[PDB]
Amino acid sequence: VDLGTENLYFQSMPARVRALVYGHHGDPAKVVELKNLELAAVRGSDVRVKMLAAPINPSDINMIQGNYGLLPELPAVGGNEGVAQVVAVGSNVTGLKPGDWVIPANAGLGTWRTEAVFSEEALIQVPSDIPLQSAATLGVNPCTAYRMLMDFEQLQPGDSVIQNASNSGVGQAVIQIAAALGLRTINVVRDRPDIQKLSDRLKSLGAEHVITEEELRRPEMKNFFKDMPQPRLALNCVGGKSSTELLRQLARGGTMVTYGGMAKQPVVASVSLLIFKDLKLRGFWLSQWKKDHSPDQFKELILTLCDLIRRGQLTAPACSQVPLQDYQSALEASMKPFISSKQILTM
Amino acid sequence: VDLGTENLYFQSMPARVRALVYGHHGDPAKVVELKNLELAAVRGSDVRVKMLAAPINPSDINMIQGNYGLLPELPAVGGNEGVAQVVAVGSNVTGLKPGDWVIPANAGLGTWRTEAVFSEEALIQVPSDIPLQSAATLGVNPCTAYRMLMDFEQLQPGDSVIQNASNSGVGQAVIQIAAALGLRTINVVRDRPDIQKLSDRLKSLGAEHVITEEELRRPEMKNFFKDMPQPRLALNCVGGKSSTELLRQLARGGTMVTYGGMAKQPVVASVSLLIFKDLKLRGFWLSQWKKDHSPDQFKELILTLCDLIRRGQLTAPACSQVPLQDYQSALEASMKPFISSKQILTM
Numbered sequence: 001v002d003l004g005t006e007n008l009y010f011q012s013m014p015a016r017v018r019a020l021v022y023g024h025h026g027d028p029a030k031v032v033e034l035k036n037l038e039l040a041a042v043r044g045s046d047v048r049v050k051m052l053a054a055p056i057n058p059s060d061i062n063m064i065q066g067n068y069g070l071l072p073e074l075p076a077v078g079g080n081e082g083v084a085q086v087v088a089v090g091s092n093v094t095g096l097k098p099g100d101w102v103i104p105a106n107a108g109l110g111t112w113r114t115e116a117v118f119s120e121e122a123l124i125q126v127p128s129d130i131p132l133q134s135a136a137t138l139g140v141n142p143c144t145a146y147r148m149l150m151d152f153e154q155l156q157p158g159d160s161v162i163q164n165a166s167n168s169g170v171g172q173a174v175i176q177i178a179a180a181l182g183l184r185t186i187n188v189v190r191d192r193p194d195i196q197k198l199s200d201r202l203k204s205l206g207a208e209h210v211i212t213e214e215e216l217r218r219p220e221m222k223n224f225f226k227d228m229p230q231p232r233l234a235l236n237c238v239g240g241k242s243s244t245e246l247l248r249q250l251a252r253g254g255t256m257v258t259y260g261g262m263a264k265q266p267v268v269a270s271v272s273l274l275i276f277k278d279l280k281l282r283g284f285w286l287s288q289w290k291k292d293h294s295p296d297q298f299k300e301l302i303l304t305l306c307d308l309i310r311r312g313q314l315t316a317p318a319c320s321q322v323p324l325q326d327y328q329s330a331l332e333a334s335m336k337p338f339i340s341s342k343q344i345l346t347m
Numbered sequence: 348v349d350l351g352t353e354n355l356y357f358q359s360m361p362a363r364v365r366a367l368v369y370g371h372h373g374d375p376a377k378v379v380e381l382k383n384l385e386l387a388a389v390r391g392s393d394v395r396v397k398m399l400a401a402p403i404n405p406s407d408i409n410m411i412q413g414n415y416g417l418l419p420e421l422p423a424v425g426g427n428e429g430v431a432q433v434v435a436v437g438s439n440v441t442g443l444k445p446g447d448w449v450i451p452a453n454a455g456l457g458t459w460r461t462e463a464v465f466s467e468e469a470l471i472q473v474p475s476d477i478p479l480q481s482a483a484t485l486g487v488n489p490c491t492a493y494r495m496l497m498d499f500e501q502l503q504p505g506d507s508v509i510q511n512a513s514n515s516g517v518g519q520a521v522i523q524i525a526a527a528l529g530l531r532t533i534n535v536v537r538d539r540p541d542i543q544k545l546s547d548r549l550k551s552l553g554a555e556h557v558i559t560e561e562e563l564r565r566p567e568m569k570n571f572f573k574d575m576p577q578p579r580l581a582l583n584c585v586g587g588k589s590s591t592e593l594l595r596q597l598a599r600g601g602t603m604v605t606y607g608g609m610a611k612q613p614v615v616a617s618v619s620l621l622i623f624k625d626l627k628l629r630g631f632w633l634s635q636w637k638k639d640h641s642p643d644q645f646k647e648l649i650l651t652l653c654d655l656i657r658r659g660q661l662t663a664p665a666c667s668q669v670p671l672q673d674y675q676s677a678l679e680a681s682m683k684p685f686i687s688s689k690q691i692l693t694m
Contacts, residue, residue: 069623140633239618261618268615271608274630276416281628285620 001052001346003132003321012050012087018347019113020327023075025066028331030152032064032078034324040117044092047120049102052084053136053321054111056258056334056343057169067263070107070287077110079345080287083126083135084116093120101128103139103302105295107287114264114324114347124299127306131315134309136344137169142305142314144259144286145173149181152282153253157182160228162249163235164188164213164242165200169317169342170259174204174235176314179206183327186224186231188216188246205315216245224249233257237263249274255280319344348399348693350479350668359397359434365694366460367674370422372413375678379411379425379667381671387464391439394467396449400483400668401429401458403608403681403690404516414610417454417634426692427634429494430473430482431463440467448475450486450649452642454634459694461671471646474653480663481656484516489652489661490645491606491633492520495688496528499602499629500580504529507575509596510582511535511560511589514545516689518604518663519552521582523661526553531570533578535563535593539685563592571596579602586612594620602627666691 001010015043018038020238022031042048060079062068069092086100096102104111109122126135149155161178165171168185178185187202189195189213199210215221230251236243237260247256247269256279273279290298308314320341322330330343348357364386369378371641378569390397407417407426433447443449449470451458456469473482496502508525512518523534534549536542538559546557556575562568577598583590584607594603594616602628605614620626637645667688669677677690 067619069619244613258616258618260622263617263619266591266615266617267621268613269628270606270610270613271604271630272414272416272610274605274614274628275607275632276630276635278632278635281616281621282473283618283625284621285622285625288623288625341652 001132001321003344003346005132008128008132009298010050010052010085012085015114017113017115018324019110020078020324021075022064022078022158023137025064025071028061028064028078028335029328032327032331034327037113037139042088042090042117044090045120046090046117047086047093047123048117049084049090050087050115050121051082051084051111051113051347052101053132054079054345056330056345057081057139057140059107059140059315061335072108072110076115079110079112080104080107080141081137082111083132083138084111087115090120096120096123096125099128101126101135103135103200105298106290112327112345113323118119121295124295124302126302130306130309130315133344134314137316137319138302138305139307141169142173142177143301144170144284145177146301146305147182147286147289148235148257148259148284149174149177149233151284152257155181155183155233158184158229160184160186160231161233162186162188162231162246164246165237166202166207166210166261168237170237172202172317173314175202175205175207179310180308180313184208184228186211186228186249188213188242213242213245217241221249230254235259236267237261239267241268243267244270247276247279250277250279252277253279255282257282257284259284268270317342321346323347348479350400350666350691350693352479355475355479357397357399357432359432359536362461364460364462365671366457367425368422369411369425372418372421373407373410375411375425375490376675376681379674379678381674384460389435389437390466391437391487392467393437393464394433394440394443394470395435395462395464396431396470396684397434397462398429398431398458398460398694399448400479401426401692402484403677403692404428404487406454406487408682416632419455419457424460426457426459427451427454428484428487429458430479430485431458434462437467443467443472444468446475448473448482450482452645453637459671459674459692468642471642471649473649477653477656478663480666480691481661482661484666484689485649485652485656487633488516489524491517491518492524493648493652494532494633494636495582495604495606495631496521496524496580498631499604502528502530502580505576505580507530507531508580508582509532509533509535509578511593512584512607513549513554513557515584517584519549520661522549522552522554524655527655527660531555531575533558533575533596535560535589544646560589568596572632577601582606583606583614586614588615590614591617594626597624599624600626602629604631606631610657619643639642664689668693670694
């Protein structure tokens with residue numbers, strides 16, 4: 001599989017099954033091993049799929065480390081996100097057919113492998129006319145972005161939204177989806193030499209303002225809201241003082257939604273802000289959303305996002321294609337504090 | 348005025364007007380002075396009241412210090428809570444009459460004085476058949492307790508609620524009101540030599556469990572919820588690690604409401620708790636509630652609480668009566684970390 005192909009057809013002739021498996025929780029670099037697996041049987045309502053591409057995401061890493069809200073039984077296959085082609089279907093399957101592309105209906109499936117047999121209900125069909133890189137990353141980051149923009153505060157064109165980790169996959173999707181919604185984004189990024197290039201890139205995605213964490217926390221920020229309404233929504237993935245400074249920007253009655261961060265960097269909320277500004281703090285967990293909603297509700301979200309991708313309104317972040325056998329370097333790269341390219345395992 | 352009288356009638360013959368006034372924000376002990384004021388005129392819709400008793404509350408102190416969400420213009424009279432008797436009414440007043448008891452309709456009025464002229468709309472009539480100590484403290488602490496129990500989570504008999512600062516005025520009211528609602532309270536208190544006496548007293552108010560902050564944070568707390576459902580509501584006034592440990596006790600989807608605390612002790616929320624447990628953090632500001640609702644809505648709350656007081660189901664905490672002239676000692680006593688008696692200024 002060549003991740004960047006414009007020829008979205010692939011051969012699926014028989015080959016050995018290989019998977020990235022971990023038998024203990026721990027450092028992904030140490031616990032994840034490439035293994036051969038036996039050919040599994042396709043029961044009545046099962047389908048056999050051939051994995052095309054699967055990103056390495058923070059949640060994949062946290063799961064392997066054992067610091068996540070869902071922990072598949074061990075030994076487990078790594079990876080929660082990816083796109084696969086249906087290659088065979090059980091005798092009772094009528095809703096998927098060979099050649100269909102599918103992504104997992106929820107977390108926990110184990111996507112870092114060449115092929116697998118899954119229950120039909122564990123999968124969602126996705127359109128096969130979108131770039132592979134987009135299909136591979138469709139089910140997590142832009143879904144999280146869309147849900148947080150829709151589910152917490154009622155926003156209309158010209159309203160503002162503030163976020164941190166703006167250059168992350170979710171942050172870049174927030175920028176693009178907010179732009180399509182007519183929202184005005186204030187996008188906080190970590191301080192970095194050569195901030196200009198990053199700012200230009202995020203503005204090319206539709207970002208209205210791009211400011212560093214240092215700019216966020218300095219007195220001049222108090223004057224930021226001439227020509228710009230205060231946001232009623234703040235999206236956080238950083239915690240600590242950064243999360244407190246995001247809170248400080250919210251309009252009275254606003255909500256800050258936390259969708260990621262580190263253990264030992266909790267979110268910090270001043271008493272004055274909670275009480276006198278009546279701010280709200282919430283979390284968002286996409287996997288719980290998927291559990292709580294129908295497969296059809298997830299599919300509807302997917303289709304909405306695909307409409308955006310076809311129009312060039314939702315483009316994937318920079319990616320590096322890595323053959324499954326070269327996973328070790330990809331895992332190492334994915335655990336750095338500054339990742340320049342999303343690592344995407346191909347087979 | 349003798350605060351503990353069972354004879355709830357008082358003389359209101361003319362006397363000089365004396366008030367506790369501050370001209371700068373700062374240490375209440377330093378900025379608050381006893382002053383004589385001129386006799387004010389009663390306009391058409393004004394009423395003249397004689398103050399009977401007024402507590403000293405944390406919010407009064409924070410206002411004087413300048414660290415509060417509402418700051419009356421200076422020079423200002425101290426105090427936001429109290430009960431007064433109407434002594435005279437303007438020609439257009441028909442809803443209050445001489446002899447009625449009233450409390451402020453909202454914060455900011457300046458209650459630490461012997462008498463005042465206020466707009467009729469700035470006051471709420473309260474029943475005059477309840478003890479003076481109860482009338483003096485009715486408008487803030489039990490109102491805050493009731494509102495937080497009613498406004499955030501739908502609770503039914505047998506559901507649990509957890510709180511800290513359980514021996515405070517609000518905490519004691521939460522215990523009593525929760526008891527009357529058929530709720531099961533878990534009441535966290537600060538560690539103190541001779542904890543037994545405090546625990547007995549809070550249980551005499553209807554508290555189900557009384558545990559110290561140390562007991563809250565120790566591993567054994569993980570086993571606390573056999574025979575007891577996890578609370579969907581937590582009430583916080585402490586912040587810091589204490590607030591994090593309260594959060595840890597909430598059922599998935601629960602809410603922690605913060606209604607007080609210190610500057611420099613912010614509320615701290617772990618990412619895991621926000622995301623995987625879908626917890627909510629909120630604030631509650633009674634003065635904002637009063638601003639947002641009608642005087643009639645506040646009066647309805649008052650009447651509900653008075654029904655409880657008459658039945659012995661809402662008793663006032665221990666109080667010390669302090670003549671207005673002796674305010675300095677009362678202010679000093681009210682600013683200690685462990686206050687044994689609520690200080691109530693009388694005139």
